[PDB]
Amino acid sequence: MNPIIYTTLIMTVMSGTMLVMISSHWLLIWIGFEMNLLAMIPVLMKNFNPRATEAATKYFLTQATASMMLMMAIIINLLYSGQWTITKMFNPVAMTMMTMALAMKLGLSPFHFWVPEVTQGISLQAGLLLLTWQKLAPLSVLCQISQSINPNLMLTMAMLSILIGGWGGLNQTQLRKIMAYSSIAHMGWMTAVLPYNTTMTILNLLIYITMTLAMFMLLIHSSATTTLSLSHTWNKMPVITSLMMVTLLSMGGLPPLSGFMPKWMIIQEMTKNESIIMPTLMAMTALLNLYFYMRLAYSSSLTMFPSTNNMKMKWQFEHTKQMKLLPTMIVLSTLVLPMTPALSSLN
């Protein structure tokens, strides 16, 4: 792919997301979603492999179904209200259909099945975009219609997402699949507080985006896609695997790391609304995510695995590609807990 063409496709994805987050008309939100899908498919297939084609096809099918359901919901809302503005949806059936469509776009379980497959099929560069940038538009739409969202359906989807993400992450040895299941769990965490307080959803989204950017950029800097391949990184570059262990501990939600901020604030907001069983269950189920993160930390840094002889040649050379945002993303994802009262700026 020509670099100019790749830049145009990336800018088209970003422009689709900005159209979704900027318009006041439902038709333009659907248009932005369509542009996002159109410009995302070739970005998924930048490196041509049968696995890449399979991932692109599955993603296209899922997003197409979700967009069709979303447009049907929009049309029904127009029929029962004569309105196109992004506001309190005036039909419960349309609200349910739109919720299902947006959950399918986000990958909330039981619409989670495509995420581990599409994430594994595509490269790390495309996986980062899929797991970070592709969550902005549906979350923004959900935040704009949080008033009309049926709390029961959203809470059930969030709890199922957390449970399924934790369970799926335990049986995975491919790093991309582990990241996909962690993303599913974190999306459930974000959508748990949508009916209660959207600013907490925004905070969780920002923290998750920083953590996933750090993790994916570390994986790219190590060129590792499996636990065994990542294990060798302790020999060539111990700093990368140590930072990866710290970021995994942060993702587990362990204080004083930044990953404690979203869970803590979410539990606070959900207890303010007299919901005590759901946040407790979510906190207890986060232990599975913490488990597979810890297992990875063992295989990567906490314990040293056997390397190969050819790493001696690799010792001499230094990395050429330089990701300028990696140190900032690592710092913001590990040492920002003393800065929670900054929550107000998101209001």
């Binding site: 987050m21 333009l28 029929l79 029962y80 503005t85 902005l136």
Partner: protein, 105 residues
């Protein structure tokens, strides 16, 4: 995150097609222009929470204009009763309703 750049920069990208009461080419009014105008002017600035319960009569009139569900129900009841009366011969449709009188211009 509804980044309302339209209200900030003053641009009008899609607010011209959000409602049928907005300006339309050749001033072609919407079928429910009056009802939507009343509903919008009633519920302007008071917030969505208040608008749902306070300006509810206007919204109900707007919905009835849009879908005519209750009007169709009344017409169906009238038709059913007329058919039942005709079956029993208790009613005779007038000539102007039987296509016997010339309709006024």
């Amino acid at each position: 995150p509804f980044f309302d750049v339209q209200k900030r920069l003053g641009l009008d990208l899609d607010r011209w097609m959000t409602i049928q009461s907005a300006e339309q080419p050749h001033k072609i009014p919407g079928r429910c222009h009056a009802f939507e105008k009343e509903w919008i002017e009633c519920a302007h600035g008071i917030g969505g929470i208040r608008a749902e319960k306070e300006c509810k009569i206007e919204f109900d009139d707007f919905v009835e204009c849009l879908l005519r569900q209750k009007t169709m129900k009344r017409l169906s009841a009238i038709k059913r009763q007329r058919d039942k009366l005709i079956k029993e011969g208790k009613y005779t449709p007038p000539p102007h309703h039987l296509g016997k009188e010339d309709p006024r211009p």
